[PDB]
PDB file of C-alpha atoms (C1' of nucleotides) and ligand atoms in Angstrom:
ATOM      1  CA  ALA A   2     123.241-232.461 -56.815  1.00  0.00           C
ATOM      2  CA  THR A   3     120.644-235.058 -57.797  1.00  0.00           C
ATOM      3  CA  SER A   4     120.239-233.397 -61.206  1.00  0.00           C
ATOM      4  CA  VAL A   5     122.417-233.443 -64.322  1.00  0.00           C
ATOM      5  CA  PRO A   6     125.891-232.227 -63.252  1.00  0.00           C
ATOM      6  CA  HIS A   7     126.557-228.505 -63.595  1.00  0.00           C
ATOM      7  CA  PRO A   8     129.372-226.122 -62.676  1.00  0.00           C
ATOM      8  CA  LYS A   9     129.104-224.433 -59.305  1.00  0.00           C
ATOM      9  CA  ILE A  10     126.314-221.873 -59.576  1.00  0.00           C
ATOM     10  CA  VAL A  11     127.563-218.279 -59.354  1.00  0.00           C
ATOM     11  CA  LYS A  12     125.182-215.363 -58.833  1.00  0.00           C
ATOM     12  CA  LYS A  13     127.128-212.185 -59.560  1.00  0.00           C
ATOM     13  CA  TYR A  14     124.541-210.079 -57.706  1.00  0.00           C
ATOM     14  CA  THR A  15     122.293-211.743 -55.132  1.00  0.00           C
ATOM     15  CA  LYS A  16     120.459-208.675 -53.808  1.00  0.00           C
ATOM     16  CA  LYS A  17     117.530-206.929 -55.490  1.00  0.00           C
ATOM     17  CA  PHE A  18     118.166-203.922 -57.729  1.00  0.00           C
ATOM     18  CA  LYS A  19     115.896-201.396 -56.026  1.00  0.00           C
ATOM     19  CA  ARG A  20     114.828-198.165 -57.699  1.00  0.00           C
ATOM     20  CA  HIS A  21     116.428-194.974 -56.407  1.00  0.00           C
ATOM     21  CA  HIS A  22     114.436-193.348 -53.567  1.00  0.00           C
ATOM     22  CA  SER A  23     112.017-196.244 -53.290  1.00  0.00           C
ATOM     23  CA  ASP A  24     113.107-195.956 -49.643  1.00  0.00           C
ATOM     24  CA  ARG A  25     112.371-192.201 -49.438  1.00  0.00           C
ATOM     25  CA  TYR A  26     108.825-192.127 -50.875  1.00  0.00           C
ATOM     26  CA  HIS A  27     105.932-194.561 -50.686  1.00  0.00           C
ATOM     27  CA  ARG A  28     104.769-193.505 -54.164  1.00  0.00           C
ATOM     28  CA  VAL A  29     108.044-194.765 -55.681  1.00  0.00           C
ATOM     29  CA  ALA A  30     107.921-198.557 -55.900  1.00  0.00           C
ATOM     30  CA  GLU A  31     110.990-200.782 -55.628  1.00  0.00           C
ATOM     31  CA  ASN A  32     110.536-202.014 -59.215  1.00  0.00           C
ATOM     32  CA  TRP A  33     113.739-201.046 -60.982  1.00  0.00           C
ATOM     33  CA  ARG A  34     113.585-197.845 -63.014  1.00  0.00           C
ATOM     34  CA  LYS A  35     116.546-196.230 -64.745  1.00  0.00           C
ATOM     35  CA  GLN A  36     117.238-192.684 -63.580  1.00  0.00           C
ATOM     36  CA  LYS A  37     116.942-190.285 -66.511  1.00  0.00           C
ATOM     37  CA  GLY A  38     117.556-187.000 -64.701  1.00  0.00           C
ATOM     38  CA  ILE A  39     120.213-184.589 -65.893  1.00  0.00           C
ATOM     39  CA  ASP A  40     121.892-184.137 -62.496  1.00  0.00           C
ATOM     40  CA  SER A  41     121.225-187.554 -60.950  1.00  0.00           C
ATOM     41  CA  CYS A  42     124.002-188.851 -58.711  1.00  0.00           C
ATOM     42  CA  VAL A  43     122.837-192.402 -59.444  1.00  0.00           C
ATOM     43  CA  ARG A  44     122.618-191.975 -63.220  1.00  0.00           C
ATOM     44  CA  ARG A  45     126.134-190.480 -63.165  1.00  0.00           C
ATOM     45  CA  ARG A  46     127.440-193.348 -60.971  1.00  0.00           C
ATOM     46  CA  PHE A  47     128.812-191.362 -58.053  1.00  0.00           C
ATOM     47  CA  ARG A  48     130.805-193.339 -55.511  1.00  0.00           C
ATOM     48  CA  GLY A  49     128.546-194.591 -52.739  1.00  0.00           C
ATOM     49  CA  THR A  50     125.395-194.781 -54.861  1.00  0.00           C
ATOM     50  CA  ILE A  51     123.414-197.967 -55.512  1.00  0.00           C
ATOM     51  CA  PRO A  52     124.497-200.616 -58.032  1.00  0.00           C
ATOM     52  CA  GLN A  53     122.539-200.629 -61.252  1.00  0.00           C
ATOM     53  CA  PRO A  54     121.499-203.456 -63.596  1.00  0.00           C
ATOM     54  CA  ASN A  55     123.800-204.026 -66.546  1.00  0.00           C
ATOM     55  CA  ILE A  56     124.687-206.954 -68.778  1.00  0.00           C
ATOM     56  CA  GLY A  57     127.923-207.598 -66.883  1.00  0.00           C
ATOM     57  CA  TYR A  58     125.892-209.193 -64.083  1.00  0.00           C
ATOM     58  CA  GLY A  59     124.542-211.754 -66.554  1.00  0.00           C
ATOM     59  CA  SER A  60     124.486-215.366 -65.439  1.00  0.00           C
ATOM     60  CA  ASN A  61     126.791-218.087 -66.727  1.00  0.00           C
ATOM     61  CA  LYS A  62     125.008-219.675 -69.675  1.00  0.00           C
ATOM     62  CA  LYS A  63     125.634-223.130 -68.177  1.00  0.00           C
ATOM     63  CA  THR A  64     124.059-222.412 -64.774  1.00  0.00           C
ATOM     64  CA  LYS A  65     121.393-219.968 -65.968  1.00  0.00           C
ATOM     65  CA  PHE A  66     117.757-220.736 -65.010  1.00  0.00           C
ATOM     66  CA  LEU A  67     118.768-223.489 -62.546  1.00  0.00           C
ATOM     67  CA  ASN A  68     117.359-223.475 -59.027  1.00  0.00           C
ATOM     68  CA  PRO A  69     119.755-224.256 -56.137  1.00  0.00           C
ATOM     69  CA  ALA A  70     119.088-227.988 -56.633  1.00  0.00           C
ATOM     70  CA  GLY A  71     120.248-227.771 -60.257  1.00  0.00           C
ATOM     71  CA  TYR A  72     116.873-228.042 -62.005  1.00  0.00           C
ATOM     72  CA  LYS A  73     115.066-225.858 -64.489  1.00  0.00           C
ATOM     73  CA  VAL A  74     111.548-225.233 -63.218  1.00  0.00           C
ATOM     74  CA  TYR A  75     108.542-225.884 -65.463  1.00  0.00           C
ATOM     75  CA  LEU A  76     105.027-224.733 -64.585  1.00  0.00           C
ATOM     76  CA  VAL A  77     102.445-227.536 -64.492  1.00  0.00           C
ATOM     77  CA  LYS A  78      98.676-227.013 -64.448  1.00  0.00           C
ATOM     78  CA  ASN A  79      97.413-230.586 -65.006  1.00  0.00           C
ATOM     79  CA  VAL A  80      98.665-234.165 -65.172  1.00  0.00           C
ATOM     80  CA  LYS A  81      99.047-234.014 -68.961  1.00  0.00           C
ATOM     81  CA  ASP A  82     101.570-231.187 -68.504  1.00  0.00           C
ATOM     82  CA  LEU A  83     104.077-233.640 -66.991  1.00  0.00           C
ATOM     83  CA  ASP A  84     104.393-235.478 -70.323  1.00  0.00           C
ATOM     84  CA  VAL A  85     106.926-232.940 -71.630  1.00  0.00           C
ATOM     85  CA  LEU A  86     109.297-233.760 -68.742  1.00  0.00           C
ATOM     86  CA  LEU A  87     109.442-237.534 -69.327  1.00  0.00           C
ATOM     87  CA  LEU A  88     112.944-237.542 -70.831  1.00  0.00           C
ATOM     88  CA  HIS A  89     114.101-234.518 -68.790  1.00  0.00           C
ATOM     89  CA  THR A  90     113.515-235.749 -65.236  1.00  0.00           C
ATOM     90  CA  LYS A  91     117.125-235.052 -64.190  1.00  0.00           C
ATOM     91  CA  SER A  92     117.238-231.508 -65.595  1.00  0.00           C
ATOM     92  CA  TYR A  93     113.662-230.192 -65.253  1.00  0.00           C
ATOM     93  CA  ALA A  94     111.462-230.023 -62.166  1.00  0.00           C
ATOM     94  CA  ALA A  95     107.707-229.475 -62.143  1.00  0.00           C
ATOM     95  CA  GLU A  96     106.018-226.635 -60.275  1.00  0.00           C
ATOM     96  CA  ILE A  97     102.281-226.962 -59.686  1.00  0.00           C
ATOM     97  CA  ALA A  98     100.274-223.843 -60.485  1.00  0.00           C
ATOM     98  CA  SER A  99      98.728-221.997 -57.556  1.00  0.00           C
ATOM     99  CA  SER A 100      95.209-222.117 -59.025  1.00  0.00           C
ATOM    100  CA  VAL A 101      95.123-225.908 -59.416  1.00  0.00           C
ATOM    101  CA  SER A 102      92.559-227.341 -57.012  1.00  0.00           C
ATOM    102  CA  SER A 103      93.480-229.500 -54.034  1.00  0.00           C
ATOM    103  CA  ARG A 104      92.020-232.502 -55.884  1.00  0.00           C
ATOM    104  CA  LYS A 105      93.908-232.129 -59.164  1.00  0.00           C
ATOM    105  CA  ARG A 106      97.091-231.235 -57.280  1.00  0.00           C
ATOM    106  CA  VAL A 107      97.094-234.618 -55.532  1.00  0.00           C
ATOM    107  CA  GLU A 108      96.843-236.294 -58.942  1.00  0.00           C
ATOM    108  CA  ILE A 109      99.751-234.232 -60.294  1.00  0.00           C
ATOM    109  CA  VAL A 110     101.876-235.096 -57.253  1.00  0.00           C
ATOM    110  CA  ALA A 111     100.928-238.771 -57.581  1.00  0.00           C
ATOM    111  CA  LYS A 112     101.830-238.913 -61.276  1.00  0.00           C
ATOM    112  CA  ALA A 113     105.069-236.970 -60.806  1.00  0.00           C
ATOM    113  CA  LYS A 114     106.209-239.509 -58.213  1.00  0.00           C
ATOM    114  CA  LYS A 115     105.410-242.313 -60.663  1.00  0.00           C
ATOM    115  CA  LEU A 116     107.320-240.631 -63.503  1.00  0.00           C
ATOM    116  CA  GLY A 117     110.265-239.598 -61.331  1.00  0.00           C
ATOM    117  CA  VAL A 118     109.603-235.897 -61.918  1.00  0.00           C
ATOM    118  CA  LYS A 119     110.679-233.645 -59.058  1.00  0.00           C
ATOM    119  CA  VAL A 120     108.125-231.167 -57.691  1.00  0.00           C
ATOM    120  CA  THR A 121     109.447-227.843 -56.402  1.00  0.00           C
ATOM    121  CA  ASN A 122     106.337-226.996 -54.316  1.00  0.00           C
ATOM    122  CA  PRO A 123     105.103-230.396 -53.100  1.00  0.00           C
ATOM    123  CA  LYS A 124     103.095-229.416 -49.997  1.00  0.00           C
ATOM    124  CA  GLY A 125     100.793-226.474 -50.672  1.00  0.00           C
ATOM    125  CA  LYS A 126      97.117-227.506 -50.644  1.00  0.00           C
TER     126      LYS A 126
ATOM    127  C1'   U B   1     107.387-218.816 -48.029  1.00  0.00           C
ATOM    128  C1'   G B   2     110.681-218.766 -51.437  1.00  0.00           C
ATOM    129  C1'   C B   3     112.593-219.671 -56.783  1.00  0.00           C
ATOM    130  C1'   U B   4     113.940-217.628 -61.759  1.00  0.00           C
ATOM    131  C1'   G B   5     115.712-213.305 -64.815  1.00  0.00           C
ATOM    132  C1'   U B   6     121.296-208.053 -65.569  1.00  0.00           C
ATOM    133  C1'   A B   7     116.451-205.977 -65.734  1.00  0.00           C
ATOM    134  C1'   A B   8     111.409-204.635 -67.134  1.00  0.00           C
ATOM    135  C1'   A B   9     109.098-208.846 -64.515  1.00  0.00           C
ATOM    136  C1'   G B  10     107.354-214.143 -64.198  1.00  0.00           C
ATOM    137  C1'   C B  11     106.203-218.227 -61.003  1.00  0.00           C
ATOM    138  C1'   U B  12     105.233-220.164 -56.061  1.00  0.00           C
ATOM    139  C1'   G B  13     104.040-221.264 -49.928  1.00  0.00           C
ATOM    140  C1'   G B  14     100.569-219.184 -46.081  1.00  0.00           C
ATOM    141  C1'   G B  15      96.342-215.907 -44.955  1.00  0.00           C
ATOM    142  C1'   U B  16      91.869-213.415 -46.937  1.00  0.00           C
ATOM    143  C1'   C B  17      88.104-214.077 -50.641  1.00  0.00           C
ATOM    144  C1'   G B  18      83.776-215.615 -53.707  1.00  0.00           C
ATOM    145  C1'   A B  19      82.957-216.245 -60.026  1.00  0.00           C
ATOM    146  C1'   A B  20      85.264-216.090 -63.278  1.00  0.00           C
ATOM    147  C1'   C B  21      90.356-216.537 -65.440  1.00  0.00           C
ATOM    148  C1'   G B  22      94.993-217.780 -67.840  1.00  0.00           C
ATOM    149  C1'   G B  23      99.523-220.122 -71.179  1.00  0.00           C
ATOM    150  C1'   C B  24     101.098-220.149 -76.320  1.00  0.00           C
ATOM    151  C1'   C B  25     100.766-218.364 -82.152  1.00  0.00           C
ATOM    152  C1'   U B  26      98.993-213.892 -84.054  1.00  0.00           C
ATOM    153  C1'   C B  27      95.791-209.108 -84.306  1.00  0.00           C
ATOM    154  C1'   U B  28      94.651-204.435 -82.190  1.00  0.00           C
ATOM    155  C1'   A B  29      95.016-199.967 -79.078  1.00  0.00           C
ATOM    156  C1'   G B  30      91.966-194.634 -75.249  1.00  0.00           C
ATOM    157  C1'   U B  31      98.574-199.662 -73.341  1.00  0.00           C
ATOM    158  C1'   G B  32     103.030-198.493 -68.484  1.00  0.00           C
ATOM    159  C1'   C B  33     103.627-192.027 -64.118  1.00  0.00           C
ATOM    160  C1'   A B  34     106.938-189.216 -59.200  1.00  0.00           C
ATOM    161  C1'   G B  35     106.578-184.719 -60.603  1.00  0.00           C
ATOM    162  C1'   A B  36     102.974-180.813 -64.953  1.00  0.00           C
ATOM    163  C1'   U B  37     101.472-174.028 -58.509  1.00  0.00           C
ATOM    164  C1'   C B  38      98.525-181.515 -62.939  1.00  0.00           C
ATOM    165  C1'   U B  39      92.675-183.541 -62.169  1.00  0.00           C
ATOM    166  C1'   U B  40      89.129-185.801 -58.737  1.00  0.00           C
ATOM    167  C1'   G B  41      88.777-188.216 -54.125  1.00  0.00           C
ATOM    168  C1'   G B  42      90.898-189.319 -49.519  1.00  0.00           C
ATOM    169  C1'   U B  43      94.462-188.506 -45.272  1.00  0.00           C
ATOM    170  C1'   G B  44      98.375-186.242 -42.161  1.00  0.00           C
ATOM    171  C1'   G B  45     102.063-183.031 -39.314  1.00  0.00           C
ATOM    172  C1'   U B  46     100.789-178.414 -37.570  1.00  0.00           C
ATOM    173  C1'   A B  47      97.533-179.634 -32.961  1.00  0.00           C
ATOM    174  C1'   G B  48      94.267-180.949 -28.483  1.00  0.00           C
ATOM    175  C1'   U B  49      97.498-175.758 -31.019  1.00  0.00           C
ATOM    176  C1'   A B  50      95.485-170.467 -32.601  1.00  0.00           C
ATOM    177  C1'   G B  51      91.556-169.662 -30.290  1.00  0.00           C
ATOM    178  C1'   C B  52      85.922-169.651 -28.259  1.00  0.00           C
ATOM    179  C1'   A B  53      87.997-161.879 -24.434  1.00  0.00           C
ATOM    180  C1'   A B  54      82.943-155.672 -27.663  1.00  0.00           C
ATOM    181  C1'   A B  55      77.504-154.767 -26.004  1.00  0.00           C
ATOM    182  C1'   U B  56      78.219-153.232 -16.824  1.00  0.00           C
ATOM    183  C1'   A B  57      76.185-159.101 -13.967  1.00  0.00           C
ATOM    184  C1'   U B  58      75.015-162.298 -11.872  1.00  0.00           C
ATOM    185  C1'   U B  59      73.516-165.205  -7.203  1.00  0.00           C
ATOM    186  C1'   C B  60      70.532-168.557  -3.652  1.00  0.00           C
ATOM    187  C1'   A B  61      66.753-172.227  -3.327  1.00  0.00           C
ATOM    188  C1'   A B  62      62.970-175.470  -4.992  1.00  0.00           C
ATOM    189  C1'   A B  63      60.862-178.280  -9.083  1.00  0.00           C
ATOM    190  C1'   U B  64      61.903-181.439 -13.349  1.00  0.00           C
ATOM    191  C1'   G B  65      65.141-184.870 -14.980  1.00  0.00           C
ATOM    192  C1'   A B  66      69.691-190.586 -15.518  1.00  0.00           C
ATOM    193  C1'   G B  67      72.261-186.146 -15.799  1.00  0.00           C
ATOM    194  C1'   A B  68      71.204-178.805 -14.386  1.00  0.00           C
ATOM    195  C1'   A B  69      76.576-172.801 -14.787  1.00  0.00           C
ATOM    196  C1'   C B  70      72.775-172.724 -19.091  1.00  0.00           C
ATOM    197  C1'   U B  71      65.254-175.544 -18.438  1.00  0.00           C
ATOM    198  C1'   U B  72      60.895-173.867 -15.300  1.00  0.00           C
ATOM    199  C1'   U B  73      59.148-171.303 -10.885  1.00  0.00           C
ATOM    200  C1'   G B  74      60.240-168.171  -6.539  1.00  0.00           C
ATOM    201  C1'   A B  75      63.577-164.685  -4.076  1.00  0.00           C
ATOM    202  C1'   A B  76      67.196-161.127  -4.976  1.00  0.00           C
ATOM    203  C1'   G B  77      70.907-158.082  -7.688  1.00  0.00           C
ATOM    204  C1'   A B  78      71.074-155.360 -12.359  1.00  0.00           C
ATOM    205  C1'   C B  79      70.374-153.115 -17.149  1.00  0.00           C
ATOM    206  C1'   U B  80      67.731-150.986 -21.587  1.00  0.00           C
ATOM    207  C1'   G B  81      65.752-145.823 -19.452  1.00  0.00           C
ATOM    208  C1'   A B  82      60.016-143.643 -23.949  1.00  0.00           C
TER     209        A B  82
HETATM  210 MG1  LIG C   1     125.134-181.767 -65.586  1.00  0.00          MG
HETATM  211 MG1  LIG C   2      96.199-219.646 -50.785  1.00  0.00          MG
HETATM  212 MG1  LIG C   3      92.077-217.032 -54.909  1.00  0.00          MG
HETATM  213 MG1  LIG C   4      78.374-214.108 -56.306  1.00  0.00          MG
HETATM  214 MG1  LIG C   5      92.824-217.807 -74.828  1.00  0.00          MG
HETATM  215 MG1  LIG C   6      96.420-192.682 -72.224  1.00  0.00          MG
HETATM  216 MG1  LIG C   7     100.693-190.259 -58.358  1.00  0.00          MG
HETATM  217 MG1  LIG C   8      93.702-182.216 -53.598  1.00  0.00          MG
HETATM  218 MG1  LIG C   9      94.905-181.612 -41.261  1.00  0.00          MG
HETATM  219 MG1  LIG C  10      94.365-172.666 -25.750  1.00  0.00          MG
HETATM  220 MG1  LIG C  11      89.666-162.268 -30.074  1.00  0.00          MG
HETATM  221 MG1  LIG C  12      65.295-167.356 -12.679  1.00  0.00          MG
HETATM  222 MG1  LIG C  13      69.788-147.321 -15.793  1.00  0.00          MG
END
RNA sequence: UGCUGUAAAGCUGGGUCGAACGGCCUCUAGUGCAGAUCUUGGUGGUAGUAGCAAAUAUUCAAAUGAGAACUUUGAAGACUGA
């Protein structure tokens, strides 16, 4: 890791917690919703049903919010936004906003390279 | 295209697009949908399916026309049967 050293990153659950029967019906979106029904096999945690979000899956407080490269990602919309990452170049990486123009994005990439700030999305437009 | 969060979700690559829009500190509410034989609109399977079967009955040729079972004319065969 080129960032500040961290313990090995553990993700207790790496899949997406998908709402029950978001596979059965198009009207039911995958966005997680807690079953509230009286008879629900999922709400009652029958064997073979889907896993559900709970605080036990919470991330280690030392590796939380770190991308696979070991950085915390900060959203940048202009070159002045990189000033808050001057003393945090080994723990914070910059991510250029999608709505920044192709002109201003070149300036942000140019200044980040000068400051040593890492950019998580360095190519797009 | 991926990243972050236990999660609600947030951010991002590519495509499309054409005029507005967001972060944060607060304020406010007509603020979150899978159901209500919910409302309005739209779309399926059914399915090229049920079916298009009462009232006797049509046929040959020519003309017209891009095209004629169905139009026009002629010839015939019928019917309504005052
Ligand atoms: Mg019960
Ligand atoms: Mg784009
Ligand atoms: Mg756009
Ligand atoms: Mg316009
Ligand atoms: Mg504002
Ligand atoms: Mg309401
Ligand atoms: Mg609905
Ligand atoms: Mg309806
Ligand atoms: Mg239908
Ligand atoms: Mg039929
Ligand atoms: Mg019938
Ligand atoms: Mg005739
Ligand atoms: Mg007679």
